[PDB]
Design a binder for these strands. Structure first.
Ligand SMILES: [Mg+2]
Ligand SMILES: [Zn+2]
Lengths: 119, 241, 49, 57
RNA sequence: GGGGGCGAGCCCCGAGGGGCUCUCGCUUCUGGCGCCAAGCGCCCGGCCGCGCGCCGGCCGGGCGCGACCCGCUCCGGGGACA
RNA sequence: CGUUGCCCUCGGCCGAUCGAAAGGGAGUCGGGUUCAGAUCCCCGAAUCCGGAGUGGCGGAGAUGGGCGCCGCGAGGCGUCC
């Protein structure tokens, strides 16, 4: 005594379980290979960038092309105890993702440059 | 007083072109999936087509009082289950080196199960009553059996339910079930059952062999045909008589 | 309708099971006009369209 | 204004303070209204002529 | 197949009514509205008042009718021929 | 208060998917700047979309009207909608 209202017969919604696997497939999970380090390869010391440093309060970098702006802003930030305003990528005609990295006003750009090694 | 005057009736008309039909039961006109729709319109074919007698004879199935009586009897001789088997071994192993181990004791009698066991013991006349299921799935398994039974003078009957036949023994189904022996205390019973079966199956096996049984139409057809006959009757019955 | 020297006619009924306004497209009978009812069924009155 | 601007705009802009407002014109409202009233009124009248015809028969 | 009955044809009729046959399942003056139940019926959980509580009130639910019963092909149309 | 497990309840769609750097498609403009880039860099004005829990704040909702007291009167309390 339960009627059939509508003339269709849709598939009856069943139970379906979560996986409770008897073993994990790959033993350990993988370690990431795109760390604070190898995301950022090295700085540009090119007349361009050195002008961009002094003037625009930036650095300029060559970065792993797999990087977001989010990854660079948090890579830079970790390595150089520095706080970024805005990352700004481009890809060189070459294979290099060059990030331009504005630093937040309270920090200088020339100062940090000397700290890291370029100038 | 109880009564508000706000409460009106507001009764809906399910006419035509009128306030929209209520969601009435529709099982009749449901578009069922293929697996259902098929399994029904087999049953029709069985009913509709001419079924030959030796597939029909499984319709005449045992009637309630009798089958229950039969299963009340069987329940005695349901074959030794699991665990029970181990218990019978374990007690024998202890008794061998403890307080005189005879070995064979006296093994009691039980039900017999699959067609192949039965069908040796219907050629043999080992069995005194055979029980067949009516709804064995590929029939060819169990078609001869009644005709074989009756030849060997073996009371045979057709229970409803290869499952509930199969729940005597401890498995999903069983096509067949056969008593070779029964205990003296439960002897008379078996015989009171056997005799009432053979009145019903063996002894009228000619009638059963003759009797086909499909060839009945859709009532939807029948009820049209009878209407035409009631038209044909009123044409030549009330006029003269 | 393009590709057609008839006109068609968008004709709106109401659905008698769902609350829903179903619509059709008839081939126009000549002498049909808009805001004109269109009865239909065994008990439909024998007039045009 | 282009449709995905109505996202921005304030309600008031997008409709008008009336029944049916912002969907339909006022002219066609004021002819539903009086039509529907004039329809139902006949239904009531016919219901009365039916009831009198039942009482007569 | 029955109910229902405004009614029509027939049969019975004791003029109250009953049975068979039709009839409808009840929408045609308007460019409107129309679904997710009103109505009755029967049950229970808690709280309160009479205290005998399926007595009365307050709050909260469930079923039935409403929307008749039974059925073997969803409905037609071909069809043992295509 | 969330989050999920189960149970009930409701739910037509219409075909997975792809298909436009000229069709559809929210929202950036002015000035400055380089050897080579600028509606993208700097300055300055804006804007859309998404989020906003504990709700960050105002404002809207909404602060009436009745009766009854006490008070010279502004008013204060009681109690009803
Ligand atoms: Mg695409
Ligand atoms: Zn208008």
């Amino acid at each position: 005594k339960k009627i059939r209202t509508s003339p269709t017969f849709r598939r009856p919604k069943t139970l379906r379980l979560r996986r409770q696997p008897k073993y994990p497939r790959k033993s350990a999970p993988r370690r990431n290979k795109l760390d604070h380090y190898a995301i950022i390869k090295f700085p540009l010391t090119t007349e361009s960038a050195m002008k961009k440093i002094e003037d625009n309060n930036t650095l300029v970098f060559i970065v792993d092309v797999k990087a977001n702006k989010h990854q660079i802003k948090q890579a830079v930030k970790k390595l150089y105890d520095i706080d970024v305003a805005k990352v700004n990528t481009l890809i060189r005609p070459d294979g290099e993702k060059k990030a331009y990295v504005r630093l937040a006003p309270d920090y200088d750009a020339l100062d940090v440059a000397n700290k890291i090694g370029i100038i | 007083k109880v009564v508000n005057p706000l409460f009106e009736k507001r009764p809906k008309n399910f006419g035509i072109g009128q306030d929209i039909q209520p969601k009435r039961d529709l099982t009749r006109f449901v578009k069922w999936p293929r697996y259902i729709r098929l399994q029904r319109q087999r049953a029709i074919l069985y009913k509709r087509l001419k079924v030959p007698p030796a597939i029909n004879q499984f319709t005449q199935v045992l009637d309630r009082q009798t089958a229950t009586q039969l299963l009340k009897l069987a329940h005695k001789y349901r074959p030794e289950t699991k665990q029970e088997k181990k218990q019978r071994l374990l007690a024998r192993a202890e008794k061998k080196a403890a307080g005189k181990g005879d070995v064979p004791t006296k093994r009691p009698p039980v039900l017999r199960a699959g067609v192949n066991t039965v069908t040796t013991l219907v050629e043999n006349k080992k069995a005194q009553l055979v029980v067949i299921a009516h709804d064995v799935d590929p029939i060819e398994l169990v078609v001869f059996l009644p005709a074989l039974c009756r030849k060997m003078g073996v009371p045979y009957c057709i229970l409803k339910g290869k499952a509930r036949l199969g729940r005597l023994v401890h498995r999903k189904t069983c096509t067949t079930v056969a008593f070779t022996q029964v205990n003296s205390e439960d002897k008379g019973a078996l015989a009171k059952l056997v005799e009432a079966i053979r009145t019903n199956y063996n002894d009228r096996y000619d009638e059963i062999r003759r009797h086909w049984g499909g060839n009945v139409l859709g009532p939807k057809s029948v009820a049209r045909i009878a209407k035409l006959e009631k038209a044909k009757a009123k044409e030549l019955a009330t006029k003269l008589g | 309708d393009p590709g057609r020297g008839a006109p068609l006619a968008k004709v709106v009924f109401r659905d008698p099971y769902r609350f829903k306004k179903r619509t059709e497209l008839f081939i126009a009978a000549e002498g049909i006009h808009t805001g004109q009812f269109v009865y239909c069924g065994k008990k439909a009155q024998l007039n045009i369209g | 204004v282009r449709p995905k601007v109505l996202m921005r705009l304030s309600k008031t802009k997008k409709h008008v303070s009336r029944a049916y407002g912002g969907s339909m014109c006022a002219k066609c409202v004021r002819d539903r209204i009086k039509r529907a009233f004039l329809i139902e009124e006949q239904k009531i009248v016919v219901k009365v002529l039916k009831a009198q015809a039942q009482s007569q028969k």
